[PDB]
Design an enzyme around this catalytic site. Structure first.
Site, PDB file in Angstrom:
ATOM      1  CG  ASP A  90       0.924  -0.220  -4.375  1.00 50.63           C
ATOM      2  OD1 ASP A  90       1.827   0.615  -4.061  1.00 50.63           O
ATOM      3  OD2 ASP A  90       0.588  -1.174  -3.645  1.00 50.63           O
ATOM      4  CG  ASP A 182      -3.331 -13.564   0.377  1.00 51.70           C
ATOM      5  OD1 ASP A 182      -2.780 -13.151  -0.686  1.00 51.70           O
ATOM      6  OD2 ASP A 182      -4.235 -12.936   0.966  1.00 51.70           O
ATOM      7  N   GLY A 186       3.723  -7.629   4.992  1.00 56.10           N
ATOM      8  CA  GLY A 186       5.187  -7.544   5.009  1.00 56.10           C
ATOM      9  C   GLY A 186       5.864  -7.981   3.714  1.00 56.10           C
ATOM     10  CB  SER A 188       3.967  -4.554   0.811  1.00 56.19           C
ATOM     11  OG  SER A 188       2.646  -4.735   1.289  1.00 56.19           O
ATOM     12  N   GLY A 189       5.399  -5.109  -2.157  1.00 54.09           N
ATOM     13  CA  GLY A 189       6.468  -4.700  -3.065  1.00 54.09           C
ATOM     14  C   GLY A 189       7.218  -5.847  -3.709  1.00 54.09           C
TER      15      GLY A 189
END
Ligand SMILES: CCOc1cc([C@@H](Nc2ccc3c(N)nccc3c2)C(=O)NCc2cccc(S(N)(=O)=O)c2)ccc1OC(C)C
Ligand SMILES: [Ca+2]
Lengths: 250, 54
Positions: A90, A182, A186, A188-189
Site C-alpha cells: 500500500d 489511532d 481520512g 490514509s496516505g
C-alpha cells in the site's frame, strides 16, 4: 486522527493534502520538491486523473493564509504487486507537475536509507502520525491538521495483542489496543514520521485497520523501508505519458 | 559495526572491513568528527524551521 492534538501550524511541514475535485481524498508526505509518498489505496476509485491536486503548507481547511501551495499531480506510480481492494504493498509515489517552493511551512521529510531504517529507525518506539481524517469513528473529519504519537509493535506482539487481512512484511502495527488513539480512514496516505538524533524520517504510511480506534486493534502502516530502492530508482527515471503508472516490484 | 548504535553515526552508516564511514542525506555535510551531519541548505529534510529558528 483519534485522540491526538492540533499539529501547531508549520510543525508537520511535510504533510500533504490530496484533493480530487476540491474534495479531501487522502494525506501524503513530501520527500523533496517534486515527490510525494502516499498509499496506493487512495487511487482505487479515481476516474478523473486531471482533477488530482496536492496541497503543501496546509493547516486550516476553513481559511487561505497564503502559505498553501497546490500542484497538479502529473504521475501516480504504484507497485505491480499492489492489488486494488486488498491491503498489501500500500504505497504510491506521486510526481508533482511543478516543484513546490520550500519555505518555513513547506519542508520535505527525509526518506531514509533502507539499512538505517531497518537497523535503527525500526527500534525508535514512538513516531508521529498525522492528517485531517476523522476525529472519531463514525465522526467528522478535522478542520485543522492533527498529530498523534504512537508506539510501534513487533508483528508477533501485534497478532498476540489483537482480538481479517494478514500483517505482511510490508506492514507494521502502531498505536493502542484500548480504543483511545489511532489514525483513521481520512488520514490514509499520511506520514508516520520517526525522530532520530535531531532529524525526522519517513517510516510508515497510514494504510488500514478495523474501524478507527477500535478496542483490541492497532493501526496498520506500510513499512516504507521495503520500498526505499523502488522509490529511489523511480525518482531517477524520466516521466512517462499517462497519469497512472504500475512499476515492477521489487 | 553499523548494526550497533548506528555505528555512532548521526544519519547513515557504511561498513568497510574490520572500518566504518558515516554519511548524510542530501542537503547535509559530514563534520570532521566523522559522525555529525550539518545542513548545507536553507530547508534540509526532516528539520522544522519554526522550531529550529526558536
Ligand atoms: C489498503 C487499504 O485497506 C483498507 C483501508 C481502510 C480505510 N483506511 C484506514 C486507514 C487507517 C486506519 C487505522 N489506522 N485504524 C483503523 C482503521 C483505519 C482505516 C480506507 O481507506 N477505506 C476506504 C478504502 C479505499 C480503498 C480500498 C479499501 S479496501 N482495501 O478495504 O478495499 C478501502 C479500511 C480497511 C482496509 O482494508 C480491509 C481489507 C481491512
Ligand atoms: Ca488553509
Amino acid at each position: 486522527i483519534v485522540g491526538g492534538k492540533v499539529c501547531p501550524k508549520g510543525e508537520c511541514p511535510w504533510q500533504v493534502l490530496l484533493l480530487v475535485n476540491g474534495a479531501q481524498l487522502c494525506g501524503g508526505t513530501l520527500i523533496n520538491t517534486i515527490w510525494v509518498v502516499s498509499a496506493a489505496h487512495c487511487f482505487d476509485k479515481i476516474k478523473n486523473w486531471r482533477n488530482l491536486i496536492a496541497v503543501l503548507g496546509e493547516h486550516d481547511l476553513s481559511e487561505h493564509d497564503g502559505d498553501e501551495q497546490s500542484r497538479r499531480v502529473a504521475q501516480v506510480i504504484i507497485p505491480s504487486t499492489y492489488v486494488p481492494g486488498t491491503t498489501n504493498h500500500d504505497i504510491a509515489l506521486l510526481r508533482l507537475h511543478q516543484p513546490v517552493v520550500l519555505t518555513d511551512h513547506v519542508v520535505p521529510l527525509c526518506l531514509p536509507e533502507r539499512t538505517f531504517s531497518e537497523r535503527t529507525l525500526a527500534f525508535v518506539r514512538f513516531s508521529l502520525v498525522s492528517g485531517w481524517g476523522q476525529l472519531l469513528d463514525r465522526g467528522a473529519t478535522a478542520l485543522e491538521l492533527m498529530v498523534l504519537n504512537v508506539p510501534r509493535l513487533m508483528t508477533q506482539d501485534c497478532l498476540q495483542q489483537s482480538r481479517s487481512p494478514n500483517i505482511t512484511e510490508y506492514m507494521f502495527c502502531a498505536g493502542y489496543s484500548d480504543g483511545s488513539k489511532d489514525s483513521c480512514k481520512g488520514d490514509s496516505g499520511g506520514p508516520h514520521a520517526t525522530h532520530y538524533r535531531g532529524t525526522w524520517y519517513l517510516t510508515g504510511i497510514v494504510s488500514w485497520g478495523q474501524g478507527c480506534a477500535t478496542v483490541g486493534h492497532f493501526g496498520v502502516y506500510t513499512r516504507v523501508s521495503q520500498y526505499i530502492e523502488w522509490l529511489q530508482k523511480l525518482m531517477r527515471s524520466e516521466p512517462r505519458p499517462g497519469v497512472l503508472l504500475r512499476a515492477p516490484f521489487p | 559495526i553499523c548494526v550497533n548504535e548506528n555505528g555512532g553515526c548521526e544519519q547513515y552508516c557504511s561498513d568497510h572491513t574490520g572500518k566504518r564511514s558515516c554519511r548524510c542525506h542530501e542537503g547535509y555535510s559530514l563534520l570532521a568528527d566523522g559522525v555529525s551531519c550539518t545542513p548545507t541548505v536553507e530547508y534540509p529534510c526532516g528539520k522544522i524551521p519554526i522550531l529550529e529558528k526558536r
